[PDB]
Design a protein around this ligand. Sequence first.
Ligand SMILES: NC(=O)C1=CN([C@@H]2O[C@H](COP(=O)(O)OP(=O)(O)OC[C@H]3O[C@@H](n4cnc5c(N)ncnc54)[C@H](OP(=O)(O)O)[C@@H]3O)[C@@H](O)[C@H]2O)C=CC1
Length: 308
Amino acid sequence: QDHFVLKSGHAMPAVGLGTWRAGSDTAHSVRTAITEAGYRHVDTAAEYGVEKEVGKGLKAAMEAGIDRKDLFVTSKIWCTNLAPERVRPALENTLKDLQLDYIDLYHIHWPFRLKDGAHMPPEAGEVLEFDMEGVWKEMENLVKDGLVKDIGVCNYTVTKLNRLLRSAKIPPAVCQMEMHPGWKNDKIFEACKKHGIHITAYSPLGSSEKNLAHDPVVEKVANKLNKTPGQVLIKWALQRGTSVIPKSSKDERIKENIQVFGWEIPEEDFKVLCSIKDEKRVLTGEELFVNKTHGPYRSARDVWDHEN
Ligand SMILES: NC(=O)C1=CN([C@@H]2O[C@H](COP(=O)(O)OP(=O)(O)OC[C@H]3O[C@@H](n4cnc5c(N)ncnc54)[C@H](OP(=O)(O)O)[C@@H]3O)[C@@H](O)[C@H]2O)C=CC1
């Protein structure tokens, strides 16, 4: 499939362009991706600090004749804005940056409220209680008011998800999570599956930090299939049945990364890829949420409700 259909009925393209740490070429990258490479999904977030430039990319893409209706734009509401009263202004800011009337998916970026002026790593009192029910309620009002087509969560746990599901009038459309060989998070996937929640794999290449493009297991499959490591990694996600948001700021790799249709990874190789031990986790949240001295989160384990 080149798309998924969310519970709302809206289609989401299976492959999107990640824009975190996209840098100076951000706007060019978004435009190339959409016009030249045929991407119809861009993943971004306020905290990446690139939405303005992404809005410029999307603008030139729509000036090139791509209908708004055919684009899927994701953004994320940052922790600092995870208070009911701040949900709407954050979105409105995001929409101004992105030069859009609406976005297709708005995620809870991380399920943790941060104090204004919070530091990395957080100081005492800077990590606050997330009023998930109250914040989600305003996330729902975004959809009611046509500003967001679907709402989602990133970086959840099963615990947090069950909590959200007991309250949500509109369940999250999409759960976006770090997934890649060496960090499958089948635990969250199976909980999303059970609840009919679609899953996006972020950092599908291992991000830069645990990039898997040079991993011998990935290289081995890639050589046999005559695909680039990145292609194999992106295909692996699709074969798991997640959407997938590979990031590159290089036009060649932008194009490379969506040449993931009309072939498959043999199940034997898919299985080798899956058998890479889950322990290659890039985003623990430690530097965002963990104060070991004062808490409330003393370790990554606390961040992830000890689920992984
Ligand atoms: N909800 C959330 O908390 C998060 C969401 N995400 C989203 O997911 C996206 C993707 O994850 P991210 O961690 O950015 O990175 P990816 O897993 O997509 O990998 C990006 C890294 O791999 C390189 N790369 C890109 N294409 C190839 C290629 N085919 N072959 C070899 N190397 C390649 C990139 O370099 P180069 O640019 O030079 O090509 C960069 O170093 C993010 O951009 C963001 O949109 C990411 C982190 C957290």
